[PDB]
Swiss-Prot record, chain A:
NCBIfam families noted in UniProt: eS8
GO molecular function: structural constituent of ribosome
Name used for this protein in its record: Small ribosomal subunit protein eS8A
Region (Disordered): 1-30
UniProt cross-references to PANTHER family, sorted A to Z: 40S RIBOSOMAL PROTEIN S8
Species name: Saccharomyces cerevisiae (strain ATCC 204508 / S288c)
GO cellular component: 90S preribosome; cytosol; cytosolic small ribosomal subunit
Key words, A-Z: Cytoplasm, Phosphoprotein, Ribonucleoprotein, Ribosomal protein
This protein's record includes keyword Oxidoreductase: no
From Swiss-Prot, chain B:
Induction summary: Up-regulated during cold stress and following nutrient replenishment by dilution of cells fron exhausted to fresh minimal medium.
Name by which UniProt lists this protein: Protein BFR2
Protein transport listed as a keyword: yes
Species for this entry: Saccharomyces cerevisiae (strain ATCC 204508 / S288c)
Entry similarity comment: Belongs to the AATF family.
Signal peptide: none
Curated annotation (Swiss-Prot), chain C:
Role according to the record: Component of the U3 small nucleolar ribonucleoprotein. Required for the early cleavages at sites A0, A1 and A2 of the pre-ribosomal RNA. Participates in ribosome biogenesis.
UniProt source species: Saccharomyces cerevisiae (strain ATCC 204508 / S288c) (Baker's yeast)
Encoding gene, per UniProt annotation: LCP5
Domain of life: Eukaryota
Further facts: Present with 1430 molecules/cell in log phase SD medium.
N-acetylserine: residues carrying this PTM: S2
Annotated signal sequence range: none
Subcellular location(s) of the protein: Nucleus, Nucleolus
Portion of the full-length sequence here: 1 to 51 of 357
The protein, known as: U3 small nucleolar ribonucleoprotein protein LCP5
Swiss-Prot record, chain D:
GO CC list: 90S preribosome; cytosol; cytosolic small ribosomal subunit
RNA-binding found in the keyword field: yes
Recorded GO MF terms: rRNA binding; structural constituent of ribosome
Name by which UniProt lists this protein: Small ribosomal subunit protein uS17A
Organism listed in the record: Saccharomyces cerevisiae (strain ATCC 204508 / S288c) (Baker's yeast)
Record lineage: Eukaryota, Fungi, Dikarya, Ascomycota, Saccharomycotina
Function: Component of the ribosome, a large ribonucleoprotein complex responsible for the synthesis of proteins in the cell. The small ribosomal subunit (SSU) binds messenger RNAs (mRNAs) and translates the encoded message by selecting cognate aminoacyl-transfer RNA (tRNA) molecules. The large subunit (LSU) contains the ribosomal catalytic site termed the peptidyl transferase center (PTC), which catalyzes the formation of peptide bonds, thereby polymerizing the amino acids delivered by tRNAs into a polypeptide chain.
Homology family: Belongs to the universal ribosomal protein uS17 family.
Entries under NCBIfam families matching the protein: PRK08572.1 (NF006345), uS17_arch (TIGR03630)
Keywords, ordered alphabetically: Acetylation, Cytoplasm, Isopeptide bond, Ribonucleoprotein, Ribosomal protein, RNA-binding, rRNA-binding, Ubl conjugation
Cross-link (Glycyl lysine isopeptide (Lys-Gly) (interchain with G-Cter in ubiquitin)): K10, K30, K40, K41, K63, K80, K89, K117, K125
Protein's cellular compartments: Cytoplasm
GO biological process, one term: maturation of SSU-rRNA from tricistronic rRNA transcript (SSU-rRNA, 5.8S rRNA, LSU-rRNA)
Modification after translation: N-terminally acetylated by acetyltransferase NatA.
Length: 170, 296, 51, 127
RNA sequence: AUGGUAGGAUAGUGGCCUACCAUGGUUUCAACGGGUAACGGGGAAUAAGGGUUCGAUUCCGGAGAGGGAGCCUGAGAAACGG
């Protein structure tokens, strides 16, 4: 029953709520479909006759890229640690767009050994991500909006993307 | 005719440049006008205000009196100098004697009535002359004589017809939109020496025409910022409207409901209506439980 | 710091604010009423031979 | 500096800064194409596209951040009064961080997938 | 309420909504406010081969199916065909 209609607002002057229509089918402000982590669940929603939106209610893995060589595998999720526009969204652990979520990127390491053949100090990458392949808790954002895609996509953070975000972590 | 037309154009702009410079006096005077309205109003409230900071208030009141009397003498002096140079005052000998005389407050009072009366006779001559000048030039005298007499009054006549009603326009200037309360205003009304605050007679906020004047400022300053820059287009004018009303006296959290609202929500009065003594103990042994805690 | 003290200095800061600007304004008006025209308007003397 | 919020911003661009040609006879200033501000809502090096309606007018207010108010006006001809009368309707437009815009400053504005409910136009050229 | 960015939602721009910021925007060229059986306006439409300017043509101002509340399918719709 949420409204997305434009006539509900006040004018640039601030006109006093002229009350022309009530709600119709066309301005159907849908519910906020906040997700969480867990076993994958899909809702199919029919809008505009033939457009099938995909509501992601629970999701467990994602396709996250690493831009320095341009590759992306399937990684199991761990948990969100920061979101820019909200803070209780993190405590809820609901994955929206641009949320900074932990993963255990073991097949990223397995690809790294299958492409280079050298252990990670237990052609090169900068030192601040060597702090947590030993921890095995790699940070990644969310690229796609999961509420209509029915998919979880992101990229691993790269260079200054850490150096601005652990600054915002602490 | 080219040199005679546009020599007046130098006279227009120099009068318009001098027009803008006097509004700079009108800009810089408002902090005195605002703080004067928060002064104590009665004779007795001045004395109680002089008790708290008695030595500090006495030098500043003498400093206020010296700076006001200095500013009052020179402004009469400039008004005498302006009316002589713009041939408003026909008596140069009387006006030149007033410039060299050290005047008290009452003599500056009486000379104000002298310069305003000479301006009044100059005004009714000018306003009747120029309203006749535009009506003959526009050609509407031969087309609008018999139908719209109530609207086509002369500009001098349109002035004095609004000067029939001093009463309503004096109800305008008591409108306290600023919510300014003078010192010991609450004590003086309670003592009978003097509540809808929206009309307050002892409060003198002439902001209504001054906001019109500041609207007249931004209309004339835009037209006079053509070449490089004028005196003050919007600096300390719209801000002067703001800080007297505390820029907007609004809170963003109270807007969104992100701040708590201490107002009655009119549907939710009495559905979950209260009960009897719902404490199954007699509440004084729980006071012992609250004094001597079973965790403390 | 009493409230009356803050009001009197607020008037005092505004009184000298109008005190210096009318010196500039009467300085402009004296230069526009006497024939000692400054260098910014020397062209008015050159344009009009009947000054 | 440019980084002043809780999230890094960069346009996906459908050279590290893709130049986009406006059309309608326009060209970027060199400050815009070699800048450092990101500003995806700016009509150049951003996802928004400039097209359609154009108008020119005078900036009347520039008091606050990244949008400005343009006074455009005309001596409007009332037919019954037989009078050209000046009428201004100050519309708010977006300003990009490529043009140090003050009041006055005749400019050109055009529609940019209108941003927030009154910002319908966007600056493209100063003079 | 005005913008900034982010997120949600939308078929989609969007303060539409939310988060956190900056405080602003419209005006004497009239912002806001009092009058209208606005069965009155609209070239909406041929005309009336002289009924003074129209006899006539139509768009027209909305809500609803006993009443609030929510849901449902269809390129159509918050249906009087649930």
């Amino acid at each position: 029953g949420i409204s997305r209609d434009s006539r509900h607002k006040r004018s640039a002057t601030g006109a006093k709520r002229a009350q022309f229509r009530k709600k119709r089918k066309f301005e159907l402000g849908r519910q906020p479909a906040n997700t969480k982590i867990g076993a994958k669940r899909i809702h199919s929603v029919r809008t505009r006759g033939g457009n099938k939106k995909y509501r992601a209610l629970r999701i467990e893995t994602g396709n996250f890229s690493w831009a320095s060589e341009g590759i992306s595998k399937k990684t199991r999720i761990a948990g969100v640690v920061y979101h820019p526009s909200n803070n209780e969204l993190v405590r809820t652990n609901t994955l929206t767009k641009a949320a900074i979520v932990q993963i255990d990127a073991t097949p990223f390491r397995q690809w790294f050994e299958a492409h280079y053949g050298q252990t990670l100090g237990k052609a090169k990458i900068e030192s601040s991500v060597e702090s947590q392949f030993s921890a095995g808790r790699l940070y990644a954002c969310i690229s796609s909006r999961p509420g209509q895609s029915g998919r979880c996509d992101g990229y691993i953070l790269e260079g200054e993307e850490l150096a601005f975000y652990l600054r915002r972590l602490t | 005719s080219v040199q005679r037309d546009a020599s007046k154009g130098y006279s227009i702009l120099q009068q318009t440049k001098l027009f803008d410079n006097i509004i700079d006096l009108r800009i810089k005077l408002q902090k005195a006008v605002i703080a004067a309205n928060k002064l104590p109003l009665t004779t007795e409230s001045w004395e109680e205000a002089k008790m708290d900071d008695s030595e500090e208030t006495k030098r500043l009141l003498k400093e206020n009196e010296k700076l006001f009397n200095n500013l009052f003498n020179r402004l009469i002096n400039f008004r005498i100098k302006f009316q002589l140079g713009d041939h408003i005052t026909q008596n140069e000998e009387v006006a030149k004697h007033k410039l060299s005389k050290k005047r008290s407050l009452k003599e500056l009072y009486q000379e104000t009535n002298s310069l305003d009366s000479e301006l009044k006779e100059y005004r009714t001559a000018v306003l009747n002359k120029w309203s006749t000048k535009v009506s003959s030039a526009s050609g509407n005298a031969a087309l609008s004589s018999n139908k719209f007499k109530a609207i086509n009054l002369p500009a001098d006549v349109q002035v004095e017809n609004q000067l029939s009603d001093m009463s309503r326009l004096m109800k305008r200037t008591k409108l306290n939109r600023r919510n300014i309360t003078p010192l010991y205003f609450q004590k003086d009304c309670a003592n009978g020496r003097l509540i809808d605050i929206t009309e307050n007679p002892y409060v003198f906020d002439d902001e209504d025409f001054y906001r019109v004047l500041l609207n007249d400022l931004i209309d004339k300053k835009i037209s006079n910022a053509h070449n490089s820059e004028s005196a003050a287009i919007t600096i300390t004018s719209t801000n002067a409207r703001s800080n007297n009303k505390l820029k907007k006296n609004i809170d963003t959290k109270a807007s969104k409901g992100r701040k708590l609202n201490y107002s009655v929500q009119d549907p939710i009065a009495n559905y979950e209506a209260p009960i009897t003594s719902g404490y199954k103990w007699s509440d004084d042994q729980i006071d012992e439980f609250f004094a001597g805690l079973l965790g403390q | 710091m009493s409230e009356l003290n803050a009001l009197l200095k607020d008037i005092n800061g505004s009184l000298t604010a109008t005190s210096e600007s009318l010196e500039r304004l009467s300085g402009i008006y004296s230069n526009s009423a006497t024939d000692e025209i400054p260098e910014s308007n020397q062209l008015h003397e050159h344009l009009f031979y009947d000054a | 500096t440019v980084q002043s919020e809780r999230a890094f911003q960069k346009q996906p661009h459908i050279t590290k800064r893709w130049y986009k040609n406006a059309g309608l006879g326009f060209k970027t200033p060199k400050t815009a194409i070699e800048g450092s501000y990101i500003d995806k809502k700016c009509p150049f090096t951003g996802l928004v596209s400039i097209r359609g309606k154009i108008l020119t007018g005078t900036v009347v207010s520039t008091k606050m951040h990244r949008t400005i108010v343009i006074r455009r006006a005309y001596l409007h001809y009332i037919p019954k009064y037989n009078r050209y009368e000046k009428r201004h309707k100050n519309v708010p437009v977006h300003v990009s961080p490529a043009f140090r815009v003050q009041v006055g400053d005749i400019v050109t504005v055009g529609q940019c997938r209108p941003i927030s409910k009154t910002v319908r136009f966007n600056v493209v050229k100063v003079s």
